[PDB]
Symmetry: C2
Subunit: 731 residues, 2 copies
Amino acid sequence: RERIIGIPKLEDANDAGSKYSQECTLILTEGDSAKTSCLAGLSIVGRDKYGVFPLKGKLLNVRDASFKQLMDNKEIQNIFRIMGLDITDKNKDDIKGLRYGSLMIMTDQDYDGSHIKGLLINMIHKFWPSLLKHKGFLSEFVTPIVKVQKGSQEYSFFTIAEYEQWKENTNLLGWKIKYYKGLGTSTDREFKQYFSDIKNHKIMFLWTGDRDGDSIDMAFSKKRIEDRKLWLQNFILGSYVDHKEKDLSYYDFVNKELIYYSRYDTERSIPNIMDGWKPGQRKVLYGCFKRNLRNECKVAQLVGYIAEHSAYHHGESSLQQTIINMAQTFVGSNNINFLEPCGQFGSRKEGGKDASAARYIFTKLASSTRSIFNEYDDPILKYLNEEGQKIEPQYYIPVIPTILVNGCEGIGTGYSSFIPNYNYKDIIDNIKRYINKEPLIPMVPWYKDFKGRIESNGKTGYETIGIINKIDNDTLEITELPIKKWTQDYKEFLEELLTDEKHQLILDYIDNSSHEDICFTIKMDPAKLQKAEEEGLEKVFKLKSTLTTTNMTLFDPNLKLQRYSTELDILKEFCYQRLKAYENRKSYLISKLEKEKRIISNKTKFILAIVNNELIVNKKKKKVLVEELYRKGYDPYKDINKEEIFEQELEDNEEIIAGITVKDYDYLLSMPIFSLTLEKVEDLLTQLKEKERELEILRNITVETMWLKDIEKVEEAIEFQRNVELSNREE
Amino acid sequence: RERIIGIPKLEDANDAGSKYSQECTLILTEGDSAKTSCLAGLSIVGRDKYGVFPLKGKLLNVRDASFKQLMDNKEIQNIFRIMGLDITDKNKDDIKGLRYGSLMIMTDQDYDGSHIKGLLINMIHKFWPSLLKHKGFLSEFVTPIVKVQKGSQEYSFFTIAEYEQWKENTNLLGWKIKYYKGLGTSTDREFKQYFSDIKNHKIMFLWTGDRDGDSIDMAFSKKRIEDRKLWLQNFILGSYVDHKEKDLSYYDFVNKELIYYSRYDTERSIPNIMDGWKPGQRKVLYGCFKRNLRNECKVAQLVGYIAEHSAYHHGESSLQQTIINMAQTFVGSNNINFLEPCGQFGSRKEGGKDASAARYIFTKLASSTRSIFNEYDDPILKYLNEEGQKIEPQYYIPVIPTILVNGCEGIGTGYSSFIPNYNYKDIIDNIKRYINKEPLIPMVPWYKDFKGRIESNGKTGYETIGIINKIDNDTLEITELPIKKWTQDYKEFLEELLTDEKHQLILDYIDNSSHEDICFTIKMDPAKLQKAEEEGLEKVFKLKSTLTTTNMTLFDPNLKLQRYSTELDILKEFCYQRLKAYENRKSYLISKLEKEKRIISNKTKFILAIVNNELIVNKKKKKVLVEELYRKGYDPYKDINKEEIFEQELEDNEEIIAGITVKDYDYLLSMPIFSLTLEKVEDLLTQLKEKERELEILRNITVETMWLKDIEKVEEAIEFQRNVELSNREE
């Protein structure tokens, strides 16, 4: 019968290309690993009707692709041969005589997998749009998103929303919980179970009109970019596909699933207004806070720790670089570095490219970082949950808007952003003006250790100018470059001036620039030098750069991309949010202090009672003592301990009365015998007075006073960090 | 004056190529990062006399290189132009008129850096051997290996041996300690200090005769491989270069420093006899034990943890693969996997290549692993120290020789090894024969779940044969492949049989092989099939593979490469070492039990005394109570706590009398008030009787009984793990 010659990776169904072709299904998998799991499944269902072909990487986007790219693309050519399909016959509306009568796409339940499903739908729509309208033609393999276990009574949830509804309404015992985003997570045995019940692991794509086609073209066409921008902007942040449904329209897949891939690159490339962090940097800072990185560690070790605790998925090279960039201090990088560069982290010579290997450089939190990112704020942030692990928050809320301090430069596709560096002092006096209802003052971009000029160009932004001086009639000297022109690039530019392709503008140059200062000495024809002076030396030698302020694009506090017209608009939004964050911090601290006070009060009573011989513990049966603590009015811990739940963060519990266990009083019984000694008793007594004074003071403090006080600490910390940098610089 | 045109990365000295050329030094650095640090140094010394050029990666080995490779090599051509040197003039004995009069090599103080220094010396010796004899021509930049601090009194050690001598003779307070292997570890400020005192950061290479040249040629020549093998074998394991010396001969550099790079690849590629582990796998197992990986975690998270805690430096891709390979269970991989494959870890189809992404697969210690690698052995192993961090041991000592269970295949250059898999049951009965002075029985290679035949080839080893059957006169069926012939490769081979380049041996084939079983059905010309039967079907269809036993090469227990003639020689050496390890474990456990008993005895006395009203703690001043505990005969902890020191593992301490502090008795004072309750007192009393019985039993047990008992547990664990694999396999 019919057979395929040139495709070793194909696991052709026995009946493909036969008179049973309509009954056959071809499974397209994301990778060879998925194909191997699929063959484990097919050892159940059999190999007569199911074929398997592994997709490598990501399918070509046929919609934008040139004809030559299409012919040259072996993976797509192979898929065409395997199906029995080809381009010349479009308009085909029937499933005969194809080698297979159905196509099933099997991928990870993640953004890349969704992008792959979309690319396959894109190809089918582009070449045989008729085929999508044909019912039962395209399906997708689906496994449960979450599996839970308690002894017996095992549940499997297809939808996260379903799992959340179960989780909210259940005490997680001891329930064991596993997420199944990737196909690799499933064992071969589990694949056998899915294929044993394949109907319940299959979702059929449904065509619901021309909007489906318009959706696919909007997603993948080179000409629909603005429609795509509108589509991304109008996205509803709760949107998700309901896997409980046996059917899924193409329009719903594109709008409620593919969109997550489509918007992911913008999410990676553009920082949030609130902390100025892109998500990867935020993962790094979160990792540093979690371990409390106050002492040096190797960057490579930090890379391993962040990869484990922050769920960073873009590889060690990007992670290394992200940490390094967060530690750089050279001209044109960070105004305030939040990681310390303990070693060679690169320089202005190559714009940080000249950083040393991660294995030998150390880093730690910079001395100012915990004042700026005040730890009292940590508990009021919203932390993301990935497959049950508690990872980095949606954003940090620093005391000052760090986004203005260090700026940003981002390019994804379809969105970019640039924000200049600014003086933290100008930022702080704008904050004080915001607190006092005083008019805000526009800020001029400012760069630490830059010696040149920054001035408005009057239209789109600002210009930075380096320093060049006439030494004598033959000689020029350059002692400063414009912002972000690295020394090595400039040196190459002077060398190209030496060659005739640039008309021998200069006779000679000596470069004695250091790692951080600029020293070029240039020799010229005296007449050429004079003419260059008339043209303007800065222009001739290209010593100006432009800081454009017309595209200050950030994610807003509600996770929505915005363009801010000026630095003041950014500052105002930040101030409104930050002032609210101070109200949340105050309420949280009050609730925490009340809980601490109650715990102290119980310990004080317990210790005094033993020490005054009112309470006898020696040789007392434990249940008798717990009963006595309960009867005498001691709070079991659960009454004081009134909190989002992250799955991976999870003398008997036999109820004495009424609901009390021994563990309920561990916070008292656990206290060391040393607590009964005199100094310890005295300190314990001291503790409650101090706790109530601290609570009373907190109750009456305003948010403006809390902020103003933190700003005071931030100014001191920044100045100390800077003074240390200067002291280190001096001989 | 003279100047260089085509080399942007060059930082030419101002006086290079001038009449001052002899006074100039050219610094060759390992990378751009090193060059940037060097310019930080030169901002002190000035730029008139020092030039800097960054080496990229590793210099070409000119000795083996073809002429075309030499001409084509821009980095070397550039170095020649910068120096003013070139090939045509060999025999040059003078330093004029070179652009620079001295060459200084600046690298990391690690194996790769040493290899780079060697490559540069190799080039100079090959083209201008005369130049090496010229004194002061080649030097090397050296920083202190270790810097220590206590307040003031900062010391810097150039030699590790010097640092060890200081460390042994000093209490590390509170001393802060940093290693400086890589150049990147040093700040720009530190570089300024080294260049402020450059004479004390420079070592001059010295030529001491023709042995130096012979040393360099032996190290780098294509024709001296056997001399290199002898050189590697005769290495003295304490060997090191004395950096205290201002001079270093080429022969001493090659023999005592370069050799570490030279032998490193063999160290990476060939396992130790004792645990069957290559160092990277051993780092993985060590990491798993340290966190006690009894619950599943993502492989990518495990990768991050191992990278932090085991000092793995070969990148995430290799680390991922190492973990995955340690979890594989398919035919031809591990007889006993010590990591569990919780997900898709690959199959026989592609020999494990078809493993899923690290982000979505989970692993944990396999159920048998802690019985085989008995944790009681952990404290008696020798753990390596890297830059103050405690990492993986020299080797583990398992209960059985795992190297025979899972075999190995290693290729470095100049050494390779192959060991087949063996049946653990055969291994265990050989161990019991070793214990009883009974003759050992030769073992035949055995592979879990393999259905074919394994038989001696009579000469070099064994042969494994797959299964092929005649179905009828036109049809053959293959239901088993030989060991390590992956299904996909074999399928490609059948497809090539279909084509005329292989004379149309077969008409057709169907492949319904699963992820783990083999099913090829083949259609043939009946006459061709008969002729093939006469030739022998196994031979025609290539269903045999060879297990060669003539190159069983391992590191011996003393860290020295050996070739073992048979599996019995390996077994005997392992048994001798393991029996000694049991003596060390017994002595360690006895010492630990004696310490635990003493601690219990003190707690028992302390609790009874309080509970019986002999000792009063309530409202007693702490120093008074500590004085009373000391006077009444309680042991301060330091008297019971009698231990190699790893740097990164580091009510007042005011001496009451005579040398006692409050902390000395924390182990008593720390005990919870709950210890005074009745059940807790009763259990405490129980604890000492149990501790002395356990100690008495341990004192009189023989090593053979301890081993035999552990072997019993190992047999149970392996059988349980296997039964779970089989139960999972069943429908």
